[PDB]
Design a protein around this nucleic acid. Sequence first.
RNA 1: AUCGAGAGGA
Lengths: 62, 82, 101, 209
Amino acid sequence: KHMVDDKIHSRARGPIQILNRQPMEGRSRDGGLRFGEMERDCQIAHGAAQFLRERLFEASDP
Amino acid sequence: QANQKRITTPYMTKYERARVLGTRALQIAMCAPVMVELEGETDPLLIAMKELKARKIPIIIRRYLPDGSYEDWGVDELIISD
Amino acid sequence: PVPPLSVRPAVVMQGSARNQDDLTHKLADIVKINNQLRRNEQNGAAAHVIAEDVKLLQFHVATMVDNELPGLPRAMQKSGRPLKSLKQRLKGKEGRVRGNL
Amino acid sequence: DDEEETYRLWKIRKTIMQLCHDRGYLVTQDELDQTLEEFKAQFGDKPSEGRPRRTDLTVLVAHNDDPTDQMFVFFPEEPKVGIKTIKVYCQRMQEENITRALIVVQQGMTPSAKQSLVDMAPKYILEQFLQQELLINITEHELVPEHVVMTKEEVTELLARYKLRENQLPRIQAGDPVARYFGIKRGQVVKIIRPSETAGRYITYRLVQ
RNA sequence: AUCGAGAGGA
């Protein structure tokens, strides 16, 4: 039952939550992906400070 | 700190190179004068790479030592590793 | 300290049911019991009655701050579900810090 | 019952001589490596009967820099050291003009003696050592690198060069076994030179807190 | 839309 047509999802400035102005959840609600603690961890190891700021502040909830 | 002596390495770091290229690319994309002869280039990333290879980047790196002092290095004064 | 409406937003239903936040419900409980305590202490009340009122106000404020107190029961909504305290909002994963910062 | 006791006493004496030598004190070569036969001929063979009595194993050792600065080595008779023994030792150092001493307890220290040791530190300083930690020389273990005390001039030079405060440095507790062996104080810094598999040799600096 | 639960994929 795993048809790719039900797994593809992309987000570009869609709806945001009400408690926090962060992107919604679930492709059904046009929500973005979660840049979690391990992702920030790997970006820290990279040293991409500007990319980390863009992901966690600029592209999430300015 | 006297400019006659400096303790930091004379080689540009990868992080310094990445940030200098990004900042100069943004400046170029915001209509800044170019320090190289653009043959046919029209994209800020390769324009900044050409400027870096020409050692004509108008950016000064302020290397902050842990003690609280800083040493200012020009991009043209640093060896480019890559 | 009363949080603003942003911290405790009034959600909008698919129709017109303006459900209040659990923090708003706890705040309303605190205001009503505080008014009752004020009127009781201004009028004549028994020492044990005043002590019980103080205990209830203690419970309400302490459950607003943290609703996982040992021994004491959790504060229940008028539906059958435990409330969410300000400590629970930022305690662990899915909490404020680890889940939005 | 007796051979074990005399072997223990000889080993403690050897360990204390090595500790004094590592602390920068006048330790002769023969007293540095004294064999069982020499120890027997010098002190005795039957510690149970009184030869050697623990009172006779006292050591007077002087610093390399100044004979006017020297420390006493004490082996108390009683198993548990009391405030009375501490007081008589303090009186002995008063009359002999001695500012440093070592107390080699058999079992442990009385709490009042420990408190007196803590409070009386400035004028007369003296340290307490269980007998068990003295049966082996800790600095000779393979896990224990070489520790060397830094003078004040060297500490100032290091700080000046690294442009950092004493705080920034890694720490070693005053109650650390090696710190107790070297008899250092809070505020002093040690130099740890250890072999490395990535650079060959590495030097790290530890400040006592 | 919120909470909770269940079933699942890597």
